[PDB]
Amino acid sequence: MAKGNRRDLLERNDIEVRERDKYTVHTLGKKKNSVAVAFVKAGKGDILVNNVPLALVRPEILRTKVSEPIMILGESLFKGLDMNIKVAGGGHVSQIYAVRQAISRGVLASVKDEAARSELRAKLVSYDRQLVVSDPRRCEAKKFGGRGARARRQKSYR
Template sequence: MADVKAAKPKSEKKEKVKSVAPAVQSFGKKKVRCFNVVCLVCCLPLSHSSLKQCNQTAVAIARVRGRGRGMIKVNSVPLKLLRPEILRYKLYEPILVVGERRFRKVNMKIHVSGGGHTSQVYAIRQAIAKGLVAYYAKHYDAASALELKKQFIQYDRSLLIADPRRMEPKKFGGRGARARRQKSYR
């Protein structure tokens, strides 16, 4: 028993170090993951931008680096090897909308976690689009970033603007958040 009690504070210390990330909030001892859309563009050396995108419970962090060859990797796997194949076409949408020539100058590394297949794919495509816009705004000029934004929004607004809908918690007296039990008068 003494070993178990001694092990708990060590793991709590490790969790406190991990909670430095902006996507985790601490309320006492309980850790709660934020569902809000958070976009962070950091100023890093070697023309490097970092961007975080959340969709439902999936979180995608995109690192955009200049002087690249147009390589995009998700969790260290190239984009063309991702599965399921049907959802892979959703990931190619930002590339096809603005053209491959815009992506030839940058390399992207995306780390995604949480959620299911679909929400991860939507978080990745938002991170790709927002990362490219942020990179062009920071390292080129505002006009080219604005042009990219217009192209993305004209094609699909959800490429740049996250879906704020969340599941409402269930309440008592019924089977769901709003549904109530049927009442019989006779």
């Protein structure tokens, strides 16, 4: 239902103010019509999605996909960070991929050191480059000649 670019979602005004400030880092990730917003604060370590524990997100079979940014690296740094992700857009899979992208970008920023940041960048991008850089391709239009983007209505030459 949510567009993804609403001012409310982008600024995460849903959270109460006194807890809004404690989140410092801001991150973003998207795939196709899906926008995921992540706020980070250092802590004992934990993740959330749309007010849900990270484990119990229901593509089920894609749990490893939502958690790849973690098991790729060590849990050492993920231990000291806590996230409150909020996602909205089109399709379960798109939301999944956007979420993992946001996780990667957010963890990358919080390192606070540029050299180790570059080292993590090299490690992560070696694996699936589309964990940091976004995916560009997007749905295209349809022309009146046919009933699809490229397909045309069947023609009878006789």
